[PDB]
Write a protein that binds this DNA or RNA. Structure first.
Lengths: 49, 503, 98
DNA sequence: CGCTCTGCTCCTTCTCCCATCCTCTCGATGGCTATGAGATCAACTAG
RNA sequence: AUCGAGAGGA
DNA sequence: CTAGTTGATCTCATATTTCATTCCTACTCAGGAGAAGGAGCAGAGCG
């Protein structure tokens, strides 16, 4: 739209299920921290599991 | 560092030490016999000058100088006398040619006798002006010990009453001679300093004493733009200093005073200027020619309207189109040269006068006056142009230099310079090319009948100074000023810019 | 109005001109997104010398000291570019031909 | 056995470097104040 | 001229 | 020998103000490898 951005969101699968892969965090636009998807769902207006 | 090396520098050391101590060259040339403390026993016998101000009851200024003063000078000196007694400064705004040096001296005469001011007095003006004033101080009032501070080593060595020096001398060593027991100080024409951003302005400030006075041929009506810096000296404890004014009055003056294109009026800026200006009533002294100029003609003036030729018009525009000054960026050499180049399209171009409307206007006016038998001045602010104009009237049209053309170069000393002035005023010469700066010098060419300005300065009040020389009292014939302005060119832009200063 | 438009006209006309002329598509002030690999001149020695410009493709670079994976022929290149037509050396796989 | 102290292990961040030699072409760009006037010093010259 | 950029040769 | 005069070179004041702002990234792949530096942790002697 006169911009394109070709920006990106990153989804990080933390290694192996033995420890770090317990969760997945995402890199969001201008956000200093990677954030767990369940937090993101709350932000998305989604509560029920 | 000298070509001769240390053998030559050893000689230099000789004279150097002598300048600091006693140089026989100096002793013989400017010391022994020149009203020194050992000479004054012989000179004060001719001039014991008994101060009527102290001698006789109810007197303020001593007759020896007071009777030399003109009635109006007598009045002004008495006013200055009182300013000293009030411990305050002032502006001696007497109009040019009326005389102020003697007023200072008359005042001084009273200072060291009725005022008991036996200590040092500081007076500053140009070197050739001091050659004159030195003799005047020496022959007008030698009871105040004469000390002439010309040079550093030898000048400073005379650490004793009245101190005579120059502006050049101030740059030579005033940083060392600060507050040298000064009991009174006065500077000549204040506009020898004028520039607010100069080191002279800083020097002027440095020259601090009990009572600080400045002489000037100007008024305080609307000259504040630069007077603000003179106030540093004259009124340090009456009005304040320039940097104060820069915030106190200058801000609203600059905002409205230039006919602001938004919401601010000139009158507001003016009112601020008024608030400062009108404080200087009892400190402003002014002798006017209303009671002096009893025999002179009408000060006439006009502007010529010369149009550009096809050649000239095309080329000054072509420079602007092809040079691309705004991508070069502004304030650059060729950009700034452009300011002059667009004028040079008619002043030069490099180039017979048939290609210049201005050269043709001058041609026609001088040939008219050739038959009229009128003496005439040409007015130009540039040596490159002084010679170009001479080539115009000698290699391009010889007959114009054949109208008894005359001009001062400046390398000629005052003896020759004076004869140049006399040559033009007397029938010997009929045409003379003049610059504002020699107008300042004293080139009083009242013999002129008509004056053509080929390329003036960028300020009407400086053009005035040259005109005042041409219009000196005693003149018997009317002289009209012809400003040669070229329509459509940068000369009109320049014309309006210099008007904005006068405006 | 009609003054700022003149400024713009010069700026556009000469700006676009200049940028392609230098072969850089950024601010032109320093290393501003060079596109030297895009801007060049027509090689005129024969008929096919111009056809060369048609088919040559400017690929993205792997800096210096890197070739295979990319450059190495991938079978998705089959039918799209001609695997025989590649320049040798630094350009080995840098330039492709349709 | 807690306190403390210390040494041990790990993690994270930073920093510098891309063969030799040669040939041609293009090209952009530079490249930005003054102003003479005045004064004093040196050098030559004649009395 | 001085960099920079691009191609070819060993 | 020295005073006079005149050329040479260096350093300086007095007018235009003039005119606004310059601007963000849009961001793309960009690497290799090894040192240096901090951070936290665990256990040994001490209180």
């Amino acid at each position: 739209k006169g911009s394109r951005f070709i920006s990106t969101l990153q989804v990080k699968l933390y290694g192996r299920e033995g420890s770090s892969a317990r969760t997945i965090k995402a890199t969001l636009p201008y956000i200093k921290q990677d954030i767990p998807i369940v937090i993101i769902f709350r932000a998305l207006g989604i509560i029920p599991d | 560092l000298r070509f001769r090396g240390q053998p030559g520098e050893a000689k230099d050391d000789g004279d150097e030490l002598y300048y600091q101590e006693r140089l026989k060259k100096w002793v013989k040339q400017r010391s022994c016999g020149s009203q020194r403390s050992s000479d004054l026993p012989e000179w004060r016998r001719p001039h014991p000058n008994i101060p009527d101000a102290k001698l006789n009851s109810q007197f303020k200024i001593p007759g020896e100088i007071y009777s030399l003063l003109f009635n109006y000078q007598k009045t002004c000196v008495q006013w200055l006398y009182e300013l000293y007694q009030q411990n305050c400064g002032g502006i001696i705004g007497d109009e040019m040619g009326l005389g102020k040096t003697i007023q200072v001296i008359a005042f001084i005469a009273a200072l060291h006798h009725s005022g008991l001011l036996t200590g040092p007095v500081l007076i500053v003006c140009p070197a050739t002006v001091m050659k004159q004033w030195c003799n005047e101080f020496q022959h007008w009032w030698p009871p105040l010990r004469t000390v002439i501070l010309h040079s550093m080593g030898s000048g400073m060595a005379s650490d004793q009453h009245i101190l005579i020096t120059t502006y050049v001398g101030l740059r030579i060593h005033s940083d060392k001679l600060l507050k040298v027991k000064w009991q009174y100080a006065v500077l000549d024409e204040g506009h020898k300093i004028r520039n607010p951003d100069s080191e002279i302005s800083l020097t002027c400030k440095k020259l601090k004493t009990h009572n600080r006075i400045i002489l000037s041929g100007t008024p305080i009506q609307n000259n504040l733009t630069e007077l603000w810096s003179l106030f540093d000296f004259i009124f340090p404890g009456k009005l304040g200093t320039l940097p104060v004014f820069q915030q106190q009055f200058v801000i609203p003056i600059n905002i409205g005073g230039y006919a602001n294109a938004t919401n601010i009026q000139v009158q507001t800026g003016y009112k601020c200027a008024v608030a400062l200006r009108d404080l200087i009533s009892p400190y402003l002294l002014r002798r006017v020619k209303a009671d002096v100029a009893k025999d002179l003609p009408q000060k006439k003036e006009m502007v010529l309207f010369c149009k550009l030729t096809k050649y000239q018009r095309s080329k000054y525009l072509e420079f602007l189109h092809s040079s691309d000054l705004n991508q070069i960026q502004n304030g650059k050499r060729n950009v700034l040269f452009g300011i002059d180049i667009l004028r040079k399209i008619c002043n030069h171009p490099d180039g017979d006068p048939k290609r210049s409307g201005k050269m043709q206007v001058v041609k026609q006016l001088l040939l008219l006056w050739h038959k009229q038998g009128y003496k005439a001045l040409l007015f130009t602010q540039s040596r490159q142009m002084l010679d170009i104009l001479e080539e115009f009237i000698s290699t391009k049209d010889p007959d114009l230099s054949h109208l008894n053309y005359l001009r001062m170069d400046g390398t000629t000393n005052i003896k020759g310079r004076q004869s140049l002035v006399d040559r033009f005023n007397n029938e010997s010469f009929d045409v003379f090319l003049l610059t504002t700066r020699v107008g300042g010098l004293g080139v009083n060419l009242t013999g002129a009948n008509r004056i053509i300005i080929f390329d003036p300065d960028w300020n009407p009040s400086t053009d005035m100074q040259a005109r005042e020389r041409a219009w000196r009292i005693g003149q018997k014939r009317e002289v009209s000023i012809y400003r040669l302005m070229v329509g459509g060119s940068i000369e009109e832009k320049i014309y309006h810019r210099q008007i904005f200063k006068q405006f | 109005f009609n003054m700022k438009l003149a400024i713009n006209a010069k700026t556009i006309t000469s700006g676009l001109k200049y940028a392609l002329a230098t072969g850089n598509w950024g601010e032109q002030k320093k290393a501003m997104s060079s596109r030297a690999g895009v801007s060049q001149v027509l090689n005129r020695y024969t008929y096919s010398s111009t056809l060369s410009h048609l088919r040559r493709t400017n690929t993205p670079i792997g800096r210096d000291g890197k070739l295979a994976k990319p450059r190495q022929l991938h079978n998705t290149h089959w039918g799209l570019v001609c695997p025989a037509e590649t320049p040798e050396g630094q350009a080995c796989g840098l330039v492709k031909n349709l």
